[PDB]
Symmetry: C2
Subunit: 211 residues, 2 copies
């Protein structure tokens, strides 16, 4: 329940494709294989994008350095049906108009190869004030090494009272607006060269609403 801060350098995953720079920020609409979820029982969060967490350090609510948290009990990262990682901390923001943003600090205990049939990128037109989703011009695949930590994010509309954990099992589709937030640098190309600080919880408890 207490707020703990994660300071880390985001690092864009290098995707497997036949196009463009391999290191580019991509999101997943439809998976063809090793579909990425973070779930508790039947309830699942559909993972829409991933960045590597590099040089992480943790702080208490009072900004004293603390040790790595224990995994949140009973919540797991799965590729397909296989459990592939623990979850150290959870970030969830209940935004305007049922917008829900979830970020899991995932510590991989096994490798995974998520393959994306329909991809998504974030775009911004001259009349958008936030990033907005658009369709890839092709699919791709990710390679998630075991032992590495990843921030696995999800964006969608969901219901829930305040302090109720929300579940976004939906596909991410185009023209969905991702409201500015702490994790917004993880949606642009990140070259492991600057730190961000995000508030998290060692439980499945959301942050105070519209944040």
């Amino acid at each position: 329940e207490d707020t703990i801060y994660l300071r880390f350098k985001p690092d864009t995953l290098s995707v497997v494709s036949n196009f463009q720079p391999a290191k580019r920020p991509m999101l997943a609409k439809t998976y063809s294989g090793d579909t990425l979820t973070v779930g508790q029982g039947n309830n699942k969060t559909a993972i829409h994008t991933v960045v590597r967490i590099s040089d992480p350090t943790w702080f208490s609510a009072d900004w004293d350095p603390i040790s790595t948290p224990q995994p949140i009990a009973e919540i797991y990262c799965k590729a397909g049906t296989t459990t592939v990682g623990d979850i150290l901390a959870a970030y969830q923001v209940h935004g305007l108009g049922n917008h829900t943003t979830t970020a899991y600090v995932v510590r991989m205990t096994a490798g995974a190869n998520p393959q994306v049939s329909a991809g998504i990128v974030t775009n911004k037109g001259t009349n958008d004030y936030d990033l907005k989703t658009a369709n890839s011009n092709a699919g791709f695949s990710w390679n998630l090494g075991s032992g590495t930590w990843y921030l696995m994010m999800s964006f969608g509309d969901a219901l829930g009272s305040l302090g109720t954990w929300r579940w976004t099992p939906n596909e991410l589709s185009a023209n969905y607006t991702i409201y500015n937030c702490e994790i917004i640098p993880c949606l642009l190309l990140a070259n492991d060269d600057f730190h961000i600080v995000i508030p998290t919880k060692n439980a499945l408890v959301p942050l105070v609403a519209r944040e």
Copy 2:
């Protein structure tokens, strides 16, 4: 040397003939109360501004510290009038000659920057960072005295290693703003989330990237 600022970015509500007044805008040309942060002959042209809300400071060791003293001899000016102090300075030497500068400015007077030619950020499907584009009209900002603002500038500039760079030129279109700590200040911010940026209480840049 390094000081951390934790704060909530807050998008300025501009006065214009368009859409929501609270939208993230950048300035290409000022018609009046032109925004610069300068020291002697050297000036940085201020390209965008956000209000700093709920600021707190941390040591390099993440112990809370007090508000730093103003950096001596550097001032924020609207036109020729000095209108603010500089508490901290953020500068990143990016790819090629890309320079990103952010000043923590505490206004000691009001200011009304008058922008004839505007700039917005773009992102196409094969852009991986925000890029600048020309707005379709101008606007004005209102900077209240006593309020804190982050005043940012983006451009290519010269300087050998560890030397503070000056970007005095107008910001133009098709300029790539590389991802960094201050990138949330380019999107709509509603005073409802915190970011942490590294700064210095001197005119000294961060380690080159």
